Amino acid sequence: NPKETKFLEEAEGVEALEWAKERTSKTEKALQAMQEYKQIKKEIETIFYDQRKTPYGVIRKGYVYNFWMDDKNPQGLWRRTLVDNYSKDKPNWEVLIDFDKLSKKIGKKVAYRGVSNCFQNPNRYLISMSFGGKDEMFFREWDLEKKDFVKNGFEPITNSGKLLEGKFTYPTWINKDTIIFNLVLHKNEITSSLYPNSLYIWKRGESIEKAKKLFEVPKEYIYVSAGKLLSDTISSSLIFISANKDFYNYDNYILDTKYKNLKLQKINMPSDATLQGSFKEYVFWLLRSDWKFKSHNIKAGSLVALHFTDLLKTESDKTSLKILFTPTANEVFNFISTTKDRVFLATYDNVVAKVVTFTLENEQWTKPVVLKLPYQNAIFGMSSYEEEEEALITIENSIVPPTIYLWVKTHELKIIRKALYSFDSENYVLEQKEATSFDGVKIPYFLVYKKGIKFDGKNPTLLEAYGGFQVINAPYFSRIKNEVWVKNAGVSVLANIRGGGEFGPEWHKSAQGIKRQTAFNDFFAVSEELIKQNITSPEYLGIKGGSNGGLLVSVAMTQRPELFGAVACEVPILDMIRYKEFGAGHSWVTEYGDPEIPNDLLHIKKYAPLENLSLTQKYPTVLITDSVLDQRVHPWHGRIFEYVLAQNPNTKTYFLESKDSGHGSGSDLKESANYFINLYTFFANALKLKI
Ligand SMILES: [Cl-]
Ligand SMILES: [Cl-]
């Protein structure tokens, strides 16, 4: 019965933790006894603790800021160096905050979760932090001149000293003495998805009990957030308030903070349009749906720009709106990023990165200039601020390590850092291929292998996908997969299945809700194609997915067990009947359908893994992972799958429950390292990697 299962529903406490510890210990001892473990451990530790790891960063006021972890500092160091030093192989870094020292002090893992700098006094930062991998977080104000926390500064503590935490509580500076944030002051100030439901404004020197509530959303909404509408260099007083109603639709507002009285004014934009950035007084918005705007049908996936004042106006009064991107068939929007005098528009065309830059001249958008990316199958990233003329760009592909480039004030890329580690890209092949799905639709996939392998169906192969939430699953360079898997003659595959965002909102909507089986079919189409082409065979084929991808792979192995030889189901959502009861489950009703609506439940039960398991069926060996402090999906999902599968004597399972990773691989570097040693030992042993 579910009475037998009920103890596992409690994340912490007693019977669940003991049950989980025992299975985890059995699993770790079993992995540690496999012939492949010693070698896999060596290879992973060499990578994770490598002093030649690339120190990625962001430029502010003549310095590059970096966050660094290694075996000495697994929680990590927030640090900086002069931009002139950043080109040196081994820059002289100034350590700003040592999180390992902080953790030792408090007696708990304190994880760095980002920073926000004050425009009015740029020596002041709000440092975001969490205990381990919790979604709940807090912050502390910190001063650069002092290189220390500000005594009695902004930190969400009560008049007894009690620290208040909230899931993705992040603060925004109003002025040097005022912040706004999504504070959980009272226990009940949360939505049904358990995110903070309120925004508070808080003045320096006042108890948090004196903070003024400015905004509250209904319980049925997902979350509320505050952030800046424009660059602080244009306005520090316009705040964007975003109330996410049902994951995809929003009520958004401008909060103007500079007048005698605060002013809150509702933004008139399509409810599923999203703010993507700004430049000067203009704002960029992405469309998820077609917009009939005056004469025009502006297609779903387009980017428009408008003056911020037109956000408050009726369609009749919206004179500044311009269309900046209209995707052709294989195109999708990626991001906007801004410098002092340029806007960068990053897109994909057939899952290959493309970038242009433009500006404003005489209040008109200039003709964009192509920024040529000198990699095949390029993947693009960058950090920048409108306050800064210079920016750091990365370009990479799945088999070529990332290069970091400085964007200089004369508007060109200059190489600033190459990888210090060695990876001989010419010994590998990267192919972009397509499978044909059940309905004739072509599904992209990326295939990476070592030159010289035979296509005789005996290559150990690891196939990954995600397939949800309009997420673009781009083929980035993975040092771990390339060096631990592909260098040992394993094959790597990434499938851009529907549910994702690789071809814009329609690519997502096609496998959304009760259409989820479309995502799963896409994944089978790729799996079968790998086998047909004698890249691999079921015995050598492993599949890996996390979170939403954890549903994907548990569905795959239960519908099509005969296609696969090994599975890793990581921090999964998978109990699709009961998902609303656990963690942030209410937030995804529009993604999966509502199990309490008969028609949605009927579709969900056709695929839900716990509804489609047979005791007498051999399933592929599976590694299931979850965490006590996973507040996103809750460990129930991993625990119940293990509990039920454990009872099938035809199936071998490995289970790993982490104390404090949360929704991820580990909340410090050592724990992540151990997680990937366990995972790669599992696959190497299951699929016979020659290691
Ligand atoms: Cl930073
Ligand atoms: Cl102060």
TrEMBL record:
Keywords linked to the UniProt accession: Hydrolase, Protease, Serine protease
Keyword Hydrolase listed: yes
Pfam family, one: Peptidase_S9
The protein's Enzyme Commission number: 3.4.21.26
Identification of the protein by name: Post-proline cleaving enzyme
Organism field: Rickettsia typhi (strain ATCC VR-144 / Wilmington)
GO BP, sorted A to Z: proteolysis
PANTHER family hit by this protein: PROLYL ENDOPEPTIDASE
Gene it is expressed from: ppcE
Gene Ontology CC annotation, any one: cytosol
Domain called Peptidase S9A N-terminal: residue spans: 6-412
An example molecular function term from Gene Ontology annotations: oligopeptidase activity
Peptidase S9 prolyl oligopeptidase catalytic domain mapped to chain residues: 482-688
Keyword Hydrolase among record annotations: yes
